C-alpha cells in the first residue's frame, strides 16, 4: 500500500517528553541515595535549630534516613491507606544538669526516630491518597520582584517613575518614600505610621546641609522638607538652629503631650512609652532576616535587583548604616530626570509557575514547624533524664499538613480517567486560581484574553469556554519548563543575515528584549536573507522594516497549537471557535468495543498513547509462555533453564475494573505465544485506541439530506441497523456493599442456609453465604442473605391476628438483605470476602 | 472556678466520671507507644482496667457535642440540619 | 383548539366573568355531588374512551346570566350543609 | 460495631437509547430522539442503507468548512485501496484532491443519485455521501428523568423533601409568580403557597378528595404563618387576629 505524502517542513527536533515537568521536580525534594544534603536539607534548616529556650535545652538535627515503609505494598489499597514511608531523624537535647550528647556515661542520644511519614512518587507520577490517586496541578502567578505602576490623582507630585513606589517582597515590608508637599512629608513605615520624614534622615547621619540643601536646587517641590527645617529668609546662622541642623539633642517644640527629638523619638509614637534601653525593638527587622531577602541566597529576587536598582549590601541590610534606602531613593530621582524603566502587568516575563517539585517544599515546612507548637506543652511535665526520647515530637501534628493538601486543596484534583488520552491534558494545564493576593477576581479585559506573548508558551485556542474563559488553559507542544518557573520555547538564532539550523531555548523574559521573525519567511541557503520587510514582533508589537534587528527565528509551526489539539485534521480550514468546542468534548470521551483509527490523520496520535503509558511496553527481550486475555507472562534469559528458578515477571492484565468515573479502562493481548519480543514491543492494546493510535470513535457512512420536520432544532434520527450490531455499548458499572452490624439486639451473620419462610432467597445464595457469578434477573431481590432478628424473637398477640388471615406463618428471623435500588440494575464484577483477617485491619 | 465547670459546661448535663475515664486511658496509650511502637490493642488494656472490650466502645458514642441543628449543609440558603428528619 | 370555548367570550363584553362563570360553580357541583344540576344532559362534554362518554367538564352551562344575586360567603356555607358528601367502604 | 465486610459490583451494560448526545471532533451536536425504520429508508443503486442520516440545518453560523476534505476524499481513499498525511496548517490541496477524485468508483463530484424508498422518485439535484468522524458523548445522570408525587415532610418547616427511593419536587421559585399575577389569577396562585407546600392539614385532606372521584375543598391556614405569631410573641410585642 503506497504511502503519498504532500507536505513536510523537516524540523531539527522532535516533540519533548510531555511528562518531563511532573517528574525530575519532585526528584529534587525528597533527596534519598543520589543527593546529599539539599533538598530535604533545607526543610530541617528552617525549623531547626527549635529553641524552647526555658533554661539549658537545646535541640540540633543532624541528618536524616529512610528506611522501609509501614508494612506492605499491596494491602492499603483495599482500606484507604495513603503508601508512604516513614522518616528518621537524629535529635540531641540537653538537659540543665549538663547532659548533652557527646560521650557514653551521663550521655544519653537516640538515633533512630519514625514519626513523620510523606507519600512517593510511582512510575508516572501520581501521588495515592485514602485508595484515590491525586495529582497536583501547578498555577501561574505573578513572580516577586521590583515593579512600576501607576497612581490616580495627585497630578502635583514626586515618586519613582510615576507615583507612588510599590514594592513586594514577601512579606517583610512595604517601603514607602513618596513626596507630599504643604507640610508634614507623607512616609509610610509597614501600614500608615505617619511621621515626620525630616527626622528620619537626621538618624542616618545626614544634616541640613545634604538633602535640602544639595537638591533643592534642582526642584522647588521641597515644601515638605522645608517645614521642619524652618529655612526662611536668611537670618544669622548659629543660635537659629532647629531640628534639621542638630542631631543629638535637637529642638524641643511640639504642639502635644510629648516631644519630638529625632533619634529619640521614633519609639515614642508609640503611646505610652519606656527608656532607650530597646535600642533594636523593631530595627532589628530591617536586617538579618527573611525580610529582605526573598529566596534562599536571594536566588529568585536577584534579577529583579540588581538590574533596576545599583548593586546589592548582604542578604539584608545591615546595623545603622542601611543602603536599602539610599539605593532607592536615588531611583526615584535617576528616572525623574530622564531613564526608562517601565514594567509590564500582563507579561508573561513577570510571571512564572510553581510546579509539584517547590509546592512539595513550602507545604512540608508549615507542617513540620506545626509540632513545635506541641514540643513544648510536654517540656512543662517533663521530669528529669525522661524527656529525651520520643517523648516530645509528636507523629500526628507533623501527619497532618501534609496529608490535608495531597486531597484537600486548590491544586488537588481527581484525574479525568474518562479518556487516556483526556488524561495526559488533565495534567496539561495551568489554572490562573490560587493565592488570594497574587490573583483576584476583579476586572481584567487585558488579561483574561490572549497576548500575543503566548505565541508558542500557552495555546490560544485550548481554552475552558464560559465565565472562566482565559484563567484556564493549557501548555503547547514545544513548551516545556525548566527548574526555574517561566516557560522555555525553542528559537533558532541568527546574526546579520546568516542563520543558524541550531536552536536555542530561551525564557520569556529575554522575549521582549530582542526581537523574533517568522517562520513562513523567506530564506535561500544560510547566509543571505530574502526580503526588506521582515514581519517580526517586538513584545505585543508587530514592528517591521530591518534586517539585522532580529536574532531570533522560529524554527516550527506546530509551537502555536497544543497537544490535543494538533490531532484534528486540517486546522487551518477550521474556526478558533469550534476547534474548542471540539477539544472540550473529546476528553469527554470514552472507551468503545467498536474503535478503529480514523482514515484521515496528522502523526500525532501514536506520540500520545506512548507517553500516557497506556499500553504496555516490555523491558527485557525474551519468548513469551502464555498469551491469555487477562494474564500474560513473560520469561527472560537470565537465569539457568528451571521450572522454579528464573525471572519470573508476570504482568497483571487489568481486567473489568472500576474507574474514577465509572469508565471502561480494560486492555486486549495484541501479542501470540512463541514470537520473541523486545523492549519498545507492545503486549496490549489500550481500552480507548486500535494498534496504539487516536481510535476514540468510529466512522459511518451518511445520506445528507434534510428529514420532513423531524430534524428540526439539533434533531437527529439514527438507523436501526446501527442498534443490530450494538456498536455503541458502554459499560457504565456501579458499586454495592452490605455492612455487617452489632445491634443490642444480636450481631447477625451471613450465610446460605437461612431459616427463611420463602425459597427466593436460597436460588441465588448457595456458595455458602455468597451468590456465584454472573446471571439474570431484576431490580428489587436479594444480593447478600442477611438474617437480623426483631422484636427481641418475641411475636405479639394483636400481631397474630394479621398473620392469622394470610397463612399463620411468622418465623422469628426474616431476610433483610439489601434490595437493589431504583434504576437499573446489572451484572457482578468480583466477590470479596473478609471474614476477620488475620492481617492488619482496623 | 473547677465546681461549677465540673457539671454545668456542656448543653446537656454530663457525669463526672464520664469526663475523666477519656484522659485515663490517654495517659497510657502513649505510653505503650513511645517504648514499644505500636498500638496498644484492646486485649493487654482489658487485663488492666475493669472494663471488658465490648461495652467500653459504646461508652464513646456518648463522648459528644453533639452537634447543633441550624447548620448549612449543600444549599446554604434555606437547608437545615434538622429540616431533612422526617416525622413519625 | 377547543369546543365552544371563544364562542363564549365573544357573547358577552368581557372575560375576566367568564372566570367565575365556570369556576366557583364548576368545583362547586362536585362538592355538592351531582343532583345540584338541573339541566338536562344534553349540555356535556364528550370524551371519547372505550366507546363511551365520561367525566362532564363545563362550559357549556353558560347561558341566562345575571347582575346581582347572592353574597360570597353562602355560596359554600349552605352548600356543603344540605350535602355532607363522604366516602364509604362494604 | 461491624464484623465483617462483603462488597459486590453491578457492571452495566448501557446501549444506545434515544436521549443522549453526539458530537465529533469539529463540533456536530446533536441528539437522537426517532428511530428510523429500514423499510422507509431511501439509498443508493447498488441497494446501501444509510448508517445516520445527519442535518443540513445549520452552517453559516459555525464557520468551521474543513471537513470536507475528509468526506470527499474518504471516499476516494476507501477506492483506491492509501492513508493520507496532511500535517498542520499545511497538507493536501483543493486541485490535489480534485486529482485523486479522478479514480474511486464512479463519481468524482460526490453527488451521487438517491433513490426514494418512499414515493420512489428520485431526488431532484443528488446529495453527498462518505464517511464522517463522529462520537457518542457519556450520557450524565444530570438530567435523568424526575418526578415526584407524594415524599416525606419535615416537623417545624413542614415542605415537600427527596429522599433517595423517593424523586424530588420541584420549587416553584419566585420568578415563577409574578408571571402568573400578571394575567391576574386566583386560586392557582394560592394553592402554590399552602396545600402543595406549607400548608399539612390540607394537604392530607385533598389526598382524600381526589380518590373517591371528588373535589378539594378550600385550604387553611399556612403553618410558616400561625408559627409566626409565637415567633413574633417573644419578641416583647403581643399579636391577636380579628375577624370582620
Not at chain 1, 602 to 627: F, L
Not at chain 3, 29 to 36: A, E
Not at chain 4, 188 to 207: A, C, I, W
Amino acid at each position: 500500500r503506497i504511502r503519498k505524502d504532500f507536505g513536510k517542513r523537516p524540523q531539527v527536533l522532535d516533540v519533548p517528553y510531555l511528562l518531563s515537568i511532573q517528574l525530575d521536580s519532585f526528584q529534587k525534594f525528597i533527596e534519598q541515595d543520589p543527593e546529599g544534603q539539599y533538598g530535604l536539607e533545607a526543610a530541617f534548616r528552617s525549623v531547626f535549630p527549635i529553641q524552647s529556650y526555658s533554661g539549658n535545652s537545646e535541640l540540633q538535627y543532624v541528618s536524616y534516613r529512610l528506611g522501609e515503609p509501614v508494612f506492605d505494598v499491596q494491602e492499603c489499597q483495599i482500606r484507604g491507606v495513603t503508601y508512604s514511608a516513614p522518616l528518621r531523624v537524629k535529635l540531641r537535647l540537653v538537659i540543665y544538669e549538663r547532659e548533652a550528647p557527646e560521650g557514653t556515661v551521663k550521655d544519653i542520644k537516640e538515633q533512630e526516630v519514625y514519626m513523620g511519614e510523606i507519600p512517593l512518587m510511582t512510575d508516572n507520577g501520581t501521588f495515592v491518597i485514602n485508595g484515590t490517586e491525586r495529582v497536583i496541578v501547578s498555577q501561574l502567578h505573578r513572580s516577586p520582584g521590583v515593579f512600576f505602576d501607576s497612581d490616580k490623582g495627585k497630578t502635583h507630585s514626586s515618586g519613582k517613575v510615576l507615583y507612588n513606589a510599590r514594592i513586594i517582597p514577601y512579606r517583610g515590608s512595604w517601603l514607602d518614600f513618596e513626596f507630599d508637599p504643604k507640610d508634614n512629608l507623607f512616609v509610610r513605615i509597614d501600614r500608615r505610621r505617619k511621621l515626620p520624614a525630616t527626622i528620619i534622615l537626621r538618624a542616618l547621619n545626614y544634616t541640613t546641609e545634604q538633602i535640602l540643601d544639595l537638591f533643592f536646587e534642582k526642584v522647588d517641590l521641597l515644601a515638605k522638607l522645608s517645614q521642619s527645617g524652618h529655612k526662611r529668609i536668611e537670618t544669622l546662622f548659629t543660635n537659629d538652629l532647629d531640628h534639621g541642623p542638630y542631631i543629638s539633642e535637637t529642638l524641643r517644640v511640639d504642639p502635644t503631650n510629648d516631644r519630638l527629638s529625632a533619634l529619640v523619638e521614633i519609639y515614642r509614637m508609640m503611646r505610652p512609652g519606656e527608656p532607650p534601653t530597646r535600642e533594636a525593638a523593631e530595627s532589628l527587622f530591617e536586617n538579618l532576616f527573611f525580610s529582605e531577602d526573598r529566596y534562599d541566597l536571594s536566588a529568585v529576587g536577584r534579577m529583579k535587583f540588581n538590574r533596576s536598582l545599583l548593586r546589592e549590601e548582604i542578604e539584608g541590610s545591615g546595623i545603622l548604616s542601611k543602603d536599602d534606602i539610599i539605593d532607592v531613593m536615588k531611583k526615584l530621582i535617576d528616572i525623574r530626570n530622564g531613564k526608562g524603566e517601565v514594567d509590564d502587568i500582563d507579561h508573561l516575563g513577570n510571571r512564572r509557575i510553581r510546579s509539584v517539585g517547590e509546592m512539595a517544599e513550602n507545604q512540608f515546612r508549615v507542617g513540620l514547624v506545626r509540632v513545635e507548637r506541641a514540643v513544648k506543652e510536654r517540656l512543662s511535665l517533663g521530669d528529669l533524664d525522661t524527656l529525651m526520647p520520643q517523648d516530645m515530637i509528636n507523629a500526628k501534628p507533623i501527619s497532618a499538613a501534609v496529608k490535608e493538601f495531597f486531597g484537600s486543596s486548590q491544586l488537588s484534583q481527581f484525574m479525568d480517567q474518562n479518556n487516556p488520552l483526556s488524561e495526559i491534558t488533565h495534567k496539561r494545564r495551568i489554572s490562573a486560581l490560587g493565592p488570594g493576593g497574587l490573583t483576584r477576581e476583579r476586572a481584567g479585559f487585558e488579561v483574561r484574553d490572549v497576548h500575543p506573548t503566548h505565541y508558542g508558551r500557552v495555546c490560544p485556542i485550548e481554552t475552558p469556554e464560559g465565565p472562566n474563559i482565559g484563567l484556564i488553559n493549557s501548555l503547547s507542544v514545544y513548551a516545556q519548563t525548566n527548574e526555574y518557573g517561566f516557560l522555555e520555547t525553542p528559537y533558532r538564532k541568527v546574526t546579520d543575515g546568516v542563520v543558524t539550523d541550531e536552536i536555542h531555548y530561551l525564557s520569556a523574559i529575554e522575549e521582549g528584549n530582542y526581537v523574533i521573525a517568522q517562520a513562513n519567511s523567506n530564506l535561500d541557503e544560510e547566509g543571505h536573507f530574502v526580503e526588506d520587510l521582515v514581519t517580526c514582533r517586538s513584545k505585543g508589537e508587530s514592528s517591521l522594516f530591518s534586517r539585522d534587528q532580529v536574532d531570533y527565528m522560529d524554527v516550527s509551526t506546530q509551537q502555536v497549537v497544543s497537544v490535543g489539539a494538533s490531532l484534528i485534521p486540517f486546522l487551518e480550514h477550521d474556526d478558533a471557535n469550534r476547534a474548542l468546542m471540539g477539544a472540550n468534548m473529546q476528553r469527554q470521551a470514552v472507551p468503545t468495543l467498536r474503535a478503529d483509527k480514523p482514515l484521515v490523520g496528522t502523526g500525532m496520535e501514536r506520540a500520545v498513547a506512548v507517553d500516557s503509558g497506556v499500553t504496555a511496553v516490555a523491558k527485557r527481550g525474551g519468548v513469551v509462555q502464555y498469551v491469555d486475555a487477562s494474564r500474560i507472562v513473560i520469561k527472560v534469559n537470565e537465569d539457568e533453564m528451571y521450572p522454579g528458578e528464573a525471572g519470573i515477571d508476570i504482568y497483571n492484565l487489568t481486567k473489568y475494573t472500576r474507574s474514577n468515573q465509572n469508565t471502561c479502562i480494560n486492555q486486549m493481548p495484541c501479542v501470540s505465544l512463541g514470537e520473541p519480543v523486545e523492549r519498545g514491543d507492545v503486549l496490549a492494546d489500550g481500552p480507548s485506541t486500535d494498534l496504539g493510535e487516536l481510535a476514540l470513535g468510529q466512522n459511518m457512512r451518511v445520506a445528507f439530506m434534510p428529514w420532513n420536520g423531524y430534524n428540526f432544532e439539533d434533531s437527529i434520527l439514527v438507523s436501526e441497523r446501527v442498534v443490530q450490531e450494538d456498536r455503541f455499548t458502554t459499560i457504565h458499572i456501579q458499586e454495592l456493599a452490605c455492612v455487617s452490624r452489632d445491634t443490642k439486639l444480636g450481631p447477625e451473620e451471613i450465610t446460605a442456609d437461612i431459616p427463611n419462610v420463602g425459597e427466593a432467597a436460597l436460588s441465588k445464595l448457595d456458595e455458602s453465604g455468597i451468590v456465584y457469578i454472573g446471571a439474570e434477573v431484576t431490580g428489587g431481590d436479594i444480593l447478600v442473605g442477611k438474617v437480623t432478628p426483631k422484636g427481641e424473637t418475641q411475636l405479639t398477640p394483636e400481631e397474630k391476628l394479621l398473620r392469622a388471615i394470610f397463612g399463620e406463618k411468622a418465623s422469628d428471623v426474616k431476610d433483610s438483605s439489601l434490595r437493589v435500588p431504583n434504576g437499573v440494575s446489572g451484572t457482578v464484577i468480583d466477590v470479596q470476602v473478609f471474614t476477620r483477617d488475620g492481617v492488619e485491619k482496623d | 472556678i473547677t465546681r461549677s465547670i465540673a457539671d454545668q459546661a456542656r448543653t446537656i448535663r454530663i457525669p463526672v466520671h464520664m469526663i475523666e475515664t477519656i484522659n485515663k486511658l490517654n495517659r497510657i496509650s502513649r505510653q505503650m507507644l513511645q517504648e514499644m511502637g505500636r498500638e496498644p490493642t484492646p486485649e493487654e488494656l482489658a487485663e488492666r482496667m475493669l472494663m471488658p472490650e465490648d461495652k467500653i466502645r459504646k461508652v464513646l458514642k456518648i463522648a459528644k457535642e453533639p452537634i447543633s441543628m441550624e447548620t448549612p449543609i449543600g444549599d446554604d440558603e434555606d437547608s437545615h440540619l434538622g429540616d431533612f428528619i422526617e416525622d413519625t | 383548539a377547543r369546543v365552544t370555548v371563544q364562542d363564549a367570550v365573544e357573547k358577552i363584553g368581557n372575560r375576566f366573568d367568564l372566570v367565575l362563570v365556570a369556576a366557583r360553580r364548576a368545583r362547586q357541583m362536585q362538592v355538592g355531588g351531582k343532583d345540584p344540576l338541573v339541566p338536562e344532559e344534553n349540555d356535556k362534554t364528550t370524551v371519547i374512551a372505550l366507546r363511551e362518554i365520561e367525566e362532564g367538564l363545563i362550559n357549556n352551562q353558560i347561558l341566562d346570566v345575571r347582575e346581582r344575586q347572592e353574597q360570597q360567603e353562602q355560596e359554600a356555607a349552605e352548600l356543603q350543609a344540605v350535602t355532607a358528601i363522604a366516602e364509604g367502604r362494604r | 460495631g461491624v464484623l465483617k465486610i462483603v462488597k459486590v459490583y453491578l457492571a452495566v451494560k448501557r446501549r444506545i437509547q434515544p436521549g443522549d448526545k453526539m458530537a465529533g471532533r469539529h463540533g456536530n451536536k446533536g441528539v437522537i430522539s426517532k428511530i428510523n425504520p429500514i423499510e422507509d429508508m431511501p439509498y443508493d443503486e447498488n441497494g446501501t442503507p444509510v448508517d445516520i442520516v445527519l442535518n443540513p440545518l445549520g452552517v453559516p453560523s459555525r464557520m468551521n468548512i474543513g471537513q470536507i476534505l475528509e468526506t470527499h476524499l474518504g471516499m476516494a481513499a476507501k477506492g483506491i485501496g492509501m492513508p493520507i498525511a496532511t500535517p498542520v496548517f499545511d497538507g493536501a490541496k483543493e486541485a490535489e484532491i480534485k486529482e485523486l477524485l479522478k479514480l474511486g468508483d464512479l463519481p468524482t463530484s460526490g453527488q451521487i443519485r438517491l433513490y426514494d424508498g418512499r414515493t420512489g422518485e428520485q431526488f431532484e439535484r443528488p446529495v453527498t455521501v462518505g464517511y464522517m468522524y463522529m462520537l457518542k458523548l457519556n450520557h450524565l445522570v444530570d438530567d435523568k428523568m424526575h418526578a415526584r408525587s407524594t415524599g416525606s415532610y419535615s416537623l417545624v418547616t413542614q415542605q415537600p423533601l427527596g429522599g433517595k427511593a423517593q424523586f424530588g419536587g420541584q420549587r416553584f421559585g419566585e420568578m415563577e409568580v409574578w408571571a402568573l399575577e400578571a394575567y391576574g389569577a386566583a386560586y392557582t396562585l394560592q394553592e402554590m403557597l399552602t396545600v402543595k407546600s406549607d400548608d399539612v392539614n390540607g394537604r392530607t385532606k385533598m389526598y382524600k378528595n381526589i380518590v373517591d372521584g371528588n373535589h378539594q375543598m378550600e385550604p387553611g391556614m399556612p403553618e410558616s404563618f400561625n408559627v409566626l405569631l409565637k415567633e413574633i410573641r417573644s419578641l416583647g410585642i403581643n399579636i391577636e387576629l380579628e375577624d370582620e
